[PDB]
Amino acid sequence: EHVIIQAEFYLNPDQSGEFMFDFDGDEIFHVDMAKKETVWRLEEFGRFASFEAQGALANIAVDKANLEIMTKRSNYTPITNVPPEVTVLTNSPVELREPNVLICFIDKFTPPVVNVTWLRNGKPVTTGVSETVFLPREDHLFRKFHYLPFLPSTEDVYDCRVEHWGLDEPLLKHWEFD
Amino acid sequence: PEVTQTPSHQVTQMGQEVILRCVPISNHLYFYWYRQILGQKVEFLVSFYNNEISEKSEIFDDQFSVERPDGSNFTLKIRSTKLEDSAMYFCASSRLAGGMDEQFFGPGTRLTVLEDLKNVFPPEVAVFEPSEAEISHTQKATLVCLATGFYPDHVELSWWVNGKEVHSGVCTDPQPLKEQPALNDSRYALSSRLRVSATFWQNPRNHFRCQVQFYGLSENDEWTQDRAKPVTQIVSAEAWGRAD
Amino acid sequence: GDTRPRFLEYSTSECHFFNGTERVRFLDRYFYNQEEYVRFDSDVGEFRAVTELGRPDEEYWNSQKDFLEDRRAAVDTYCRHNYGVGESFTVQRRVHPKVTVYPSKTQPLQHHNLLVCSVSGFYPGSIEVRWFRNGQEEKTGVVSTGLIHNGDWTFQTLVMLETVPRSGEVYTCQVEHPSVTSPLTVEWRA
Amino acid sequence: LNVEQSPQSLHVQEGDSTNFTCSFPSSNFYALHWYRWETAKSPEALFVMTLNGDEKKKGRISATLNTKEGYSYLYIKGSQPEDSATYLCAFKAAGNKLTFGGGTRVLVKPNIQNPDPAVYQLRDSKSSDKSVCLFTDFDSQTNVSQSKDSDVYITDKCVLDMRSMDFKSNSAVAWSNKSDFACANAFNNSIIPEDTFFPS
Amino acid sequence: RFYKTLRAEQASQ
Ligand SMILES: *[C@@H]1O[C@H](CO)[C@@H](O)[C@H](O)[C@H]1NC(C)=O
Ligand SMILES: *[C@@H]1O[C@H](CO)[C@@H](O)[C@H](O)[C@H]1NC(C)=O
Ligand SMILES: [Mg+2]
Ligand SMILES: [Mg+2]
Ligand SMILES: [Mg+2]
């Protein structure tokens, strides 16, 4: 038993759109809206398969049009903000000096708009910071992963700061070596 | 329920700006421009959906532009025409935004881009009365229309009998012949036939007319030569019924 | 802050595969904000309105013969096709798990410590992790965090055992996963 | 990226059946369209092929689709002169843009009944000397070739249908600005039947 | 081989 999901959205007034392919909860690829090109989750997938970004681009234009049609039909009814659940974990068990990745998991939220900043000793970090797009869910909410490659030390304290319209204040999820 | 295109034909100088007009099918969501250089394949230029360009060609983008003046018209603009831009320009439209349907084509706009407008010549039209020998042998009568010395190509020849256009008993050459084949901008020749019964030709109350619609210089062009301006005109010739 | 109302148009095209590609259930679902208004189920054959908001799209999309034909053919042209494109690096993706056994705290024996069996960076999600006292299966006192997606095509599981150790103790973690032929074991000593 | 049609040109006798092929890419296939393009008219959509091994029929015209091999066949049953056109095939990928083939130009040779080959001289309604020579009422097997002489102009064979009088006829026109020029020598380059009527 | 987008249609206005 397997599941292949084509997930697409368009949000207003943000003007943010998304088109992605999913296989059993994992992203196969997405289309970069700004660059207008296919972005494979793992570089190797680009060798094993192909995709025409235009098919995705044509669908985004339709969702943009349908959003306008649906808003007008619903008498301009807005989305109810569902705040996310924030979890911080590591790629493998933590060992001092041994390279590892801090994973910030953002789950069960809507609308698919979030501001995520990594905080080492209270300061923002960008070095090697990679992120996934908004991943689909069975209950029609969204998932998001944020990554931070790091050198584990007894000197450093880490935090994932998450900003969402459903939160009263920015959520901070703490991590430190123990 | 079809796509409309204006004008039918257009003749302009190299480096000038052309605006091709289109009336897509009213409820259709996607609009397109395709072009065909004579002897070449039908080539995609641009697609349009929800007030924006979806797909565009390598031929498009450079001095090529599309516009939606209102919710009825669609235009293609070539800012600086080149000799390679001489083609049949087709406007198309399709109903669905999903693209799983047929594309409806317009009649097309035949665009002729010329380096020099001096090469342009209107046709000379002559009607040739049916042979009495043919009347005495078959009891049928064929008139011959000859349109000669025209440049550029793609004229519209039509027969008119008693003030009305006829198609039955008519046959026109699908391609014109070159008067001087040892020339790049050779003047063309075209023929057509209209066959009627001898009884119909013998009636002097019956009127026969051959019309040739020529496409040349516009009503905003440079004409410094001695001869008359070779503008878009209808050159005609006629014949009345003869008992004999 | 930004308090402006938000409007979301969301859509999912789902391909559910059973017994390989023998059974395929296709769903084309449309969502306005959090609400599902219309869907195409390959088991019904046509578009059906979920809410009253989806009724215009139900009758309009079913009237559009080319769009409806595209949906009725999706099981083979779309679902079965994309399954085949991915198959080798998707269904046949195999990554062996890294198994590490460590105690949560450096507490002395006769007291208490939580024995952690870390199973990380593996694919697919199918995993069976078992704890053994010495050679006998310990079923009681097992704290698992369950299956965790890392979002980079790898999984992880932290299975913990409640331990009261004394002098000569040999606890072992047994992990069986489709990527491995032999179930790999990791032994821990007090 | 590239679509090819075979053959480039095709000649078929009235009532007899023909077929021609279209080759398209086997990768990223969505649809294959067929268009009928008659001389003065605009391209008319004939078929939209999506499903492999599915055959569609539009009167006497049939179309087959083979996605794996990347080929499409268009069949014309009991060809009528009304079927004479350039038949274009177009491939559609994930977007909307169509990739066209070179087309198959189909010419349906009509059934010429009651032949009466003859060469007549037609005079101008305004005059003079420049008259036309009309070779008419010959069968479809008779072919009209080029002039060979620069001062003489010859047009290719053209079929007219007297719709109300249910009669079809072939014709070619010859003209020249020469004193020597006559209808008897006008159609020299072509094989004219011995029974051709040259009036006295 | 190519992944195929399931083309979306415009909603009823
Ligand atoms: C639509 O929205 C406005 C504003 O809240 C309201 O006047 C109206 O009652 C609503 N419902 C309908 C059916 O128009
Ligand atoms: C996220 O980032 C942008 C830019 O500062 C802003 O519009 C928005 O208010 C931010 N906050 C949240 C909760 O999304
Ligand atoms: Mg690619
Ligand atoms: Mg069809
Ligand atoms: Mg057949």
Structural domains of chain B, count: 2
Angstrom CA distances, B192 to A103, B66, D157, stand at: 81, 39, 11
- Domain co-membership, A18 together with A63: yes
- Domain co-membership, A133 together with A52: no
Name the residue at shortest CA distance from atom 10 of ligand 2.
A115
Q: Is C61 annotated as a binding-site member?
A: yes
Examine the fold and report which residue of A78, A111, A129 is the final residue of a domain before the chain moves on. Answer: A78
Q: In what order do the strands lie in the sheet with A142-150?
A: A85-90, A100-109, A142-150, A130-131
Q: Give me the amino acid identity at C175.
A: V
- Contact at CB, E2 and C85, closer than 8 angstroms: yes
Phi-psi group of C20: left, alpha or beta (phi > 0 → left; psi -120 to 50 → alpha; rest → beta):
left
CB-ligand 2 contact for A171 (6 Å cutoff): no
Q: What are phi and psi of D72, to 5 degrees?
A: -135, 135
- In angstroms, the CA C44 to CA C50 distance is 13
Q: How far is A30 from chain E (nearest CA, A)?
A: 12
Q: How far is D76 from chain C (nearest CA, A)?
A: 25
Beta-carbon count within 10 A of B158 CB: 18
Q: For this experimental structure, what is the resolution in angstroms? A: 2.4
- Contact at CB, C13 and E6, closer than 8 angstroms: yes
Facing residues of C174 across strands? C130, C185
- Domain co-membership, B238 together with B143: yes
Angstrom CA distances, D166 to A132, B111, B199, D16, D113, stand at: 74, 38, 17, 21, 11
Name the residue at shortest CA distance from atom 3 of ligand 2.
A115
Q: What is the CATH number of domain D1-110?
A: 2.60.40.10
Q: Which helix (H) or strand (E) holds A58?
A: helix A53-73
Q: CB contact, 8 Å: B180 with chain A?
A: no
Angstrom CA distances, D43 to B64, B106, C29, stand at: 24, 8, 37
CB A25 within 8 A of CB A138: no
Q: What is the extent of the structural domain holding A140? A: 79-178
Chains contacting A with at least 3 CB pairs below 8 Å? B, C, D, E
Instruction: Give A31-35's long-range contacts (Cβ < 8 A, gap of 24+).
Output: A31/A56, A31/A57, A31/A60, A33/A60
- Domain co-membership, B129 together with B238: yes
- In angstroms, the CA A133 to CA D98 distance is 32
Examine the fold and report which residue of A33, A49, A78 is the final residue of a domain before the chain moves on. Answer: A78
Beta-carbon count within 10 A of A102 CB: 22
CB B230 within 8 A of CB B152: no
- Domain co-membership, B242 together with B177: yes
Domain with A144 in it: what CATH number? 2.60.40.10
Please state the separation of Cα C18 from the chain's center in Å: 16
Which burial class, exposed, middle or buried, applies to B90 when counting CB atoms under 10 A from its CB (0-12, 13-18, 19+)?
buried
Please count the residue pairs, one from chain A and one from chain B, whose beta carbons lie less than 8 angstroms apart: 17
CA neighbor of C29 nearest in space, from A2, E8, A52, E4:
E8
Please state the separation of Cα B200 from the chain's center in Å: 31
CB A90 within 8 A of CB A99: no
- Domain co-membership, A64 together with A107: no
- Please list, in sequence order, all residues whose beta carbon lies within 8 angstroms of the beta carbon of residue D145, skipping any fewer than 6 positions away: D154, D189, D190
- In angstroms, the CA C73 to CA B83 distance is 46
- Domain co-membership, A52 together with A89: no
Q: Which alpha helices (H) appear in C21-160, and where do they start and end? A: 55-63, 65-72, 74, 81-90
Q: What is the extent of the structural domain holding B225? A: 116-244
- Domain co-membership, B58 together with B29: yes
- Please list, in sequence order, all residues whose beta carbon lies within 8 angstroms of the beta carbon of residue D115, skipping any fewer than 6 positions away: D137, D138, D139
Nearest atom, ligand 2, residue A165 CA: 13
Secondary structure (DSSP) of B164-218: EEE-TTEEE-SSPEESSSS-TTPPEEEEEEEEEEHHHHH-TT-EEEEEEEE--B-
CB D134 within 8 A of CB B148: no
Q: What is the dihedral of CA B56, B59, B64, B67, to 10 degrees?
A: -30
- Give residue limits of the domains in chain D: 1-110, 111-200
Q: What are phi and psi of B30, to 5 degrees?
A: -110, 135
Q: Which residues of D155-191 are buried (b: 16+ CB within 10 A; e: fewer)?
A: bebbbbbbeeeeebbbbbbbbbeeeebebeebbeebe
Q: In what order do the strands lie in the sheet with D4-6?
A: D4-6, D18-23, D71-76, D61-66, D55-58
CATH topology classification for C1-93: 3.10.320
Q: CB contact, 8 Å: B50 with chain C?
A: no
Q: How far is the CA of A42 from the centre of ligand 3 (A)?
A: 13
- Contact at CB, A64 and B50, closer than 8 angstroms: yes
Q: Give me the amino acid identity at D159.
A: V
- In angstroms, the CA B129 to CA B144 distance is 7
Q: CB contact, 8 Å: D96 with chain A?
A: yes
- In angstroms, the CA E8 to CA D187 distance is 63
Residue in A closest to B52 by C-alpha: A61
- In angstroms, the CA B92 to CA B103 distance is 6
Structural domains of chain A, count: 2
- Contact at CB, B99 and A58, closer than 8 angstroms: yes
Angstrom CA distances, C34 to A59, A136, B143, D153, E10, stand at: 20, 13, 76, 77, 20
CB-ligand 2 contact for C2 (6 Å cutoff): yes
- In angstroms, the CA C181 to CA B225 distance is 93
Identify how many contiguous H helices and E strands chain A contains and give both numbers.
2, 13
Beta strands in B14-117 (DSSP E): 18-23, 30-36, 43-49, 52-56, 64-67, 74-78, 87-94, 104-105, 109-114
Looking at chain C, which residues constitute the CATH 2.60.40.10 domain(s)?
Answer: 94-190
CB A125 within 8 A of CB A118: yes
Q: How far is the CA of E2 from the centre of ligand 3 (A)?
A: 8
- Domain co-membership, B62 together with B40: yes
Instruction: Find out whether the peptide bond into B230 is cis, omega within 30 degrees of 0.
Output: no
The ligand minimizing its distance to the Cα of C65 is 4
Q: Which helix (H) or strand (E) holds A56?
A: helix A53-73
Beta-carbon count within 10 A of B63 CB: 13
Q: Which helix (H) or strand (E) holds A9?
A: strand A2-12
Structure tokens that stand for D92 in this block: 């559609």
Name the residue at shortest CA distance from atom 2 of ligand 2.
A115
- Domain co-membership, A85 together with A117: yes
CB C183 within 8 A of CB C127: no
Chain A contact set for C98 (CB, 8 A): 92
- In angstroms, the CA D59 to CA D52 distance is 21
Q: Which residues of B1-29 are buried (b: 16+ CB within 10 A; e: fewer)?
A: eebebeeebbbbeeeeebebbbbbbeebb
Identify how many contiguous H helices and E strands chain D contains and give both numbers.
1, 16
Q: Provide Rg for chain D, Cα atoms.
A: 22
Q: Is C81 annotated as a binding-site member?
A: yes
Facing residues of A142 across strands? A109
CB A23 within 8 A of CB A49: no
Nearest atom, ligand 2, residue C2 CA: 9
Chain B contact set for C66 (CB, 8 A): 96, 98, 100-101
- Contact at CB, E4 and D27, closer than 8 angstroms: no
3-state class (DSSP) for residue B136: helix
Facing residues of D35 across strands? D45, D88
Q: Is the CA virtual torsion B161, B167, B172, B174 positive or negative?
A: positive
Beta-carbon count within 10 A of A21 CB: 28
Beta-carbon count within 10 A of B220 CB: 5
Instruction: Give D162-166's long-range contacts (Cβ < 8 A, gap of 24+).
Output: D162/B168, D162/B169, D162/B195, D163/B167, D163/B168, D163/B169, D164/B168, D165/B169, D165/B197
- In angstroms, the CA B81 to CA B87 distance is 11
Examine the fold and report which residue of A45, A78, A111 is the final residue of a domain before the chain moves on. Answer: A78
Looking at chain C, which residues constitute the CATH 3.10.320.10 domain(s)?
Answer: 1-93
Q: What are phi and psi of B110, to 5 degrees?
A: -80, 110
DSSP-based helix, strand, coil % in chain D, nearest 5: 5, 45, 50
- Domain co-membership, B125 together with B242: yes
Domain with B204 in it: what CATH number? 2.60.40.10
Name the residue at shortest CA distance from atom 1 of ligand 2.
A115
- Domain co-membership, A121 together with A171: yes
- Domain co-membership, B109 together with B145: no
The answer to whether domain C94-190 has CATH 2.60.40.10 is yes
